[PDB]
Design a protein around this ligand. Structure first.
Ligand SMILES: CCCCCCCCCCCCCC(=O)OC[C@H](COP(=O)(O)OCC[N+](C)(C)C)OC(=O)CCCCCCCCCCCCC
Ligand SMILES: CCCCCCCCCCCCCC(=O)OC[C@H](COP(=O)(O)OCC[N+](C)(C)C)OC(=O)CCCCCCCCCCCCC
Ligand SMILES: CCCCCCCCCCCCCC(=O)OC[C@H](COP(=O)(O)OCC[N+](C)(C)C)OC(=O)CCCCCCCCCCCCC
Ligand SMILES: CCCCCCCCCCCCCC(=O)OC[C@H](COP(=O)(O)OCC[N+](C)(C)C)OC(=O)CCCCCCCCCCCCC
Ligand SMILES: CCCCCCCCCCCCCC(=O)OC[C@H](COP(=O)(O)OCC[N+](C)(C)C)OC(=O)CCCCCCCCCCCCC
Ligand SMILES: CCCCCCCCCCCCCC(=O)OC[C@H](COP(=O)(O)OCC[N+](C)(C)C)OC(=O)CCCCCCCCCCCCC
Ligand SMILES: CCCCCCCCCCCCCC(=O)OC[C@H](COP(=O)(O)OCC[N+](C)(C)C)OC(=O)CCCCCCCCCCCCC
Ligand SMILES: CCCCCCCCCCCCCC(=O)OC[C@H](COP(=O)(O)OCC[N+](C)(C)C)OC(=O)CCCCCCCCCCCCC
Lengths: 217, 217, 218, 218
C-alpha cells in the first residue's frame, strides 16, 4: 500500500491540486474580510475553509509516510505542518490570533511552488554574513535602551518610562520617522543636551546599516 | 508604397515631430496658467487640435511603411495608444482624457533614440524582479488580510477594508509616519501592535535591500 | 619685471597665507552670528572682513597676470573670482542676499586646498553618467506637475494650484516625507482614487533612484 | 614574580570569567530600570554593582603589568580601562550622567569577545577613507548653518536663531524628517523663495551620501 500512496503524493497532479486549493482558499480567506459577503456566502466560506484545511492535513500526512524521516528534515514540509496545525487549532476557544494565523496557511503557496523556493533560499543565504552585525546592533540597542529609560523616562513615560518603551522609540529613531520633530525637539525643551544622545545614535546606526548593505555584496 | 517611405524616414520628419513635442509640451504646460488660458485659450486648444491632427497623420504613415513592424515596435505602440487617447473628444467623456492628453509628451522618449536606451536599461531590470515582486505582493496580501481583521473594527480608516490595509502597509513600507501616525495609535488600543509591524518592516526592508544588491551584482 | 610677481604668487607661503586668511575670515564670519559678539567686536570683525576682501582682491589679481588666459580657463580660479566678486559687491546698496553669499568666500578653502579638489572631483566625475537620468526625471516631473495642477489645484491650491507648486509637492512625495498622511490621505477624502496617481509615481521615482545608485557603484 | 601573574591573565578561564561577569552585570544593569524590581533587590543590585566594578579594577590592573606598555597600546584594553575608570568616579558626586555611563561597561563585551573585534575593526577601517568626505560634509553644513541663521533665524529663532540651532535643523533636513511640512513650507509662508535654499542643499547632501556609500563600496 505504501508504493500505492507514494505514486499519488509525488505526482505532478498532486502538487498542482494542492496549488489549486491554496489559490482557492487564499481567495476564500480574503472574502471573509467583507462583512457584506459573509451575509450571503458565509456558510459557503467557513465550510470550504474547513474543507481545505482538512484536505491539507491529509496531504501533509501522505508526505510523511512517503518520506518518513526525510519529511521532518525538510523546512518546507515542517512549515506546512505548523502552518496547517495552526489552522487546525480549534476555530473558537482562544484568541482570534489563531483564527488570523490560519491565514498563514496561504504562505503554503511558496512550498508547493518551486520557483518561489529559489527566491526565498537566495535571500536566507544572506543571513549568515549578517548575524555578525545584527548581534552587535542588538547589544547597542540594549545598552542605549537602558540609558534612555533612566534618562528621560521620568518626564517622558510614554516614550522612555519603560525599558521596552525606550526600545520601541529607539527603533523609530533608527527609521528616522519623526525622530526630531516628534521626539528630540520636545525632549530638548526639558533636557537641552538631548541632541548629544540621538544625533550620534543616528550617525552610528546609519553607518552600520550601510556597512551591512555593502557587506551583502 | 515607396513614395511615403521616403517622407516618413526623412530626418526632418523625425526632427519636425520632436519640434511639435517640445512645442505642445510647452503648450500643454501653459494650459496650466489660468491667466494664459483666458487670453490665448483658443490659440492653444487649436494648436492642440493642430498637433493631434498632424500626429494622427504621422502615426498613419509609419503604419503602412512598416506594416506589422510598426505594431511590433514598442516605441511605436506607445505613440499609437497615447495619440489615440488624445483623440477621444475634448468634452465627450470623463475629463480624465483631457488630462491624459499630456501623456503625448512622453513621445519625446520615443522620438529620441538616446532616451530609448536609458528607458530600456531600466525596464530590462524588471525581469529579474518579477520573480521577487510577486513574492512581495503575496506578502502584502497575507498581511493586508491580517491587519484588516485585527484593527479594521476600531480603525476603519486605516484597516477597515482590504484595500485600506494595502495603502497603509505600503505607507508603512515607505516608513512615512508608521510609528507616531499608525502604530502608536493602534497600541493605545492594542498594546501588542508592535509585534505585527516591527517584523513586517524588517521583512519589507530586508527584501528591498536584497533587490538592490541583486541589481548591483 | 613680470617674472618677479610670478615667483611670489606660486610661493608656498603665499598659498599658505591665503588659507590662513580663509580659516581666519571663516571663523570671523561665524562669530557675526552672535548678536552679543557683534555689539563689542563689530568693528574688529567687519574691518577684518574688509581687510580680508582687500587682500583677496589683490591675490585674485596676481593669479591672473601670472596665469594670463590660464586663469579664466581654470574653474577653481573662476570660482574664486566669482565668489570673491560676490564678496566685492558693495556692503550696502542691493539685496542682502549678496552680503550672505559673501559667506561663499569660505568655499574658497576647497580651491586653495588640493586634497579636497580630488574629493570634490571624485563626486563630479559621477555627474556625467547621470545626466542621462536627471533629464528623464525632469521630463517625468514636468508631465506629472501638469496633471497634478489640473487635477488637484482646484480644491488644493497650496499644494497643486500652480505648475511650480505641483513641482514642489511632487518633489516632497519623492522624498516620501508626509506623502501619505500629508497629501494623499487628505486628497482621498476628496478624490478617492488619488492613490492610483501617487503610489506608482513613488514606484517609478524610487526604482529610478535605486538604478542610479547601482549605476554609480559600477 | 612577573611570570606568576601572566599565567592567570593569559588563561582562557580568565578571559571567559570576564565575559561571564559582563553578561551578568549587563542583565543587572537592565534590571535597575524597573522601579518595581528596585524595591525588592535594589540593595542586592547596588552591592553587586560595586562588587563587579571592583573585580574589573583587579582585572584591568593585572593585564597592565603582564602587558606593561603593551596594555596602553591596545585600544580594546584602553577602552576597558577608560570605561572602568568612569565607574570609579563617585556614585553621587557630580552630575547623574556618570551613574548612566556605568552602562558603557557592557560594551566591554565587544572587547572581551574576539569575534566582535573583527566585525568592529572591519567597520572602523571604513571611516579613514571617508574623512576625506566627512570633513567636506562638515564644511558644507558649517557654511549653510551660517546662511540659514541670518536668513530665517530672525522670524524663526527655534530652528535657525542660533548657529547651533541651524546645525540641528539642517541635520534634521538632511535626514529628510519633516523637512518639507515641518520646516520649508512654514519658511516659505514668510520667505517665499526659501525653497531655493533647501532643495539644492538636499540634492548635494543626498548626492554625497550615495558617494559615501560608494566610497564604502569601493
Ligand atoms: C489567493 C491568491 C490571491 C488572490 C487575490 C484575491 C483578492 C480578494 C479580493 C477581496 C475583496 O476585494 O474584498 C472587497 C473589500 C470589501 O468590500 P465590501 O464593501 O465590504 O464588500 O473591499 C476592497 O478591498 C475593494 C477591492 C478593490 C480591488 C482590490 C484588489 C486587491 C487584490 C489583491 C491581489 C493580490 C495578488 C497576490
Ligand atoms: C549583557 C548582554 C546580555 C543582556 C541580556 C539581558 C536581557 C534582559 C535583561 C533585563 C531586561 C528586563 C528587565 C526590565 O527592565 O523589564 C522591565 C521593564 C520595566 O517595566 P516594569 O516596571 O517592570 O513593569 C512591567 C512591564 N511589562 C509588563 C512590560 C514587563 O518592562 C519591560 O520593558 C519588559 C521587556 C524587557 C525585555 C528586554 C529585551 C531586550 C533583550 C536584549 C538582549 C538580546 C536578546 C536577543
Ligand atoms: O522588550 C522590548 C520591548 C518590550 O515591549 P514594550 O515596549 O514594553 O511594550 C510596548 C507596548 N506599549 C508601547 C503600548 C506600552 O519590545 C519592543 O517593542 C522592542 C522593539 C523592537 C526593536 C528591536 C530592534 C533590534 C535592533 C537591531 C534590529 C535588526 C536590524 C539591524
Ligand atoms: C546628554 C544625555 C541627555 C541629556 O541631555 O540629559 C542628561 C544631561 C542633561 O542634564 P540637565 O541639562 O542638567 O537637565 C536638568 C533639567 N532638570 C533639572 C529640569 C531635570 O546631559 C548632560 O548633563 C550633558
Ligand atoms: O488593492 C489595493 C488598494 C485598493 O484600492 P482602494 O480600495 O480604492 O484604496 C484603498 C481605500 N482608500 C482610498 C480609502 C485608501 O489600493 C492601494 O492602496 C495600493 C497601494 C499600494 C499597494 C501595495 C502593494 C505593493 C506591493 C509591494 C511591492 C514592492 C516593490 C517595490
Ligand atoms: C495577546 C495578543 O497578542 O493580542 C493582544 C491584542 C489585544 O486585543 P484586545 O484585548 O481585544 O484589545 C482591546 C479591545 N477591548 C478593549 C475590547 C478589550 O490583540 C491583538 O489583536 C494584537 C495583535 C498583535 C499582533 C501579533 C501578530
Ligand atoms: C533628478 C532630480 C529630479 C529632477 C526634477 C527636480 C524636482 C523639482 C525640483 C525643482 C524645485 C521645485 O520643486 O519647483 C519649484 C519651482 C518654482 O515654482 P513656484 O510655483 O514659484 O514655487 C514657489 C511658490 N510657493 C512659494 C508658493 C511654493 O517650480 C518651477 O517653476 C520649475 C522648477 C525649476 C527647476 C527645475
Ligand atoms: C550621516 C552623517 C553625514 C556626515 C555628518 C554631517 C556633518 C555633521 C554636521 C551635523 C552636526 C549635528 C547638528 C547639531 O546638532 O549641531 C549642534 C551643535 C551646537 O548646537 P547647540 O546650539 O549647542 O545646541 C542647542 C540648540 N538645540 C537645542 C536646538 C540643538 O553644533 C556643533 O556643535 C557643531 C558640530 C559639527 C559636527 C562635526 C562633524 C562630525 C561628522 C560626523 C560624521 C558621521 C559619520 C557617518
Amino acid at each position: 500500500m505504501y508504493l500505492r500512496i507514494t505514486n499519488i503524493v509525488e505526482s505532478s497532479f498532486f502538487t498542482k491540486f494542492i496549488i489549486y486549493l491554496i489559490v482557492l482558499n487564499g481567495i476564500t480567506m480574503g472574502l471573509e474580510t467583507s462583512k457584506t459577503f459573509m451575509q450571503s456566502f458565509g456558510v459557503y466560506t467557513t465550510l470550504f475553509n474547513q474543507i481545505v484545511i482538512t484536505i491539507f492535513t491529509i496531504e501533509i500526512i501522505l508526505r510523511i509516510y512517503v518520506h518518513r524521516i526525510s519529511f521532518f528534515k525538510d523546512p518546507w514540509s515542517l512549515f506546512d505542518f505548523f502552518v496547517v496545525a495552526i489552522s487546525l487549532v480549534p476555530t473558537s476557544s482562544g484568541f482570534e490570533i489563531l483564527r488570523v494565523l490560519r491565514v498563514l496557511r496561504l504562505f503554503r503557496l511558496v512550498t508547493a511552488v518551486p520557483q518561489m523556493r529559489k527566491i526565498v533560499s537566495a535571500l536566507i543565504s544572506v543571513i549568515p554574513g549578517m548575524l555578525s552585525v545584527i548581534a552587535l546592533m542588538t547589544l547597542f540597542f540594549y545598552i542605549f535602551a537602558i540609558m534612555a529609560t533612566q534618562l528621560f523616562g521620568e518626564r517622558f513615560p510614554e516614550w522612555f518610562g519603560t525599558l521596552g518603551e525606550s526600545f520601541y522609540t529607539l527603533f523609530q529613531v533608527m527609521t528616522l520617522e519623526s525622530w526630531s520633530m516628534g521626539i528630540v525637539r520636545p525632549l530638548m525643551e526639558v533636557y537641552p543636551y538631548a541632541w548629544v544622545f540621538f544625533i550620534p545614535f543616528i550617525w552610528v546606526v546609519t553607518f552600520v546599516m550601510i556597512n551591512l548593505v555593502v557587506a551583502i555584496c
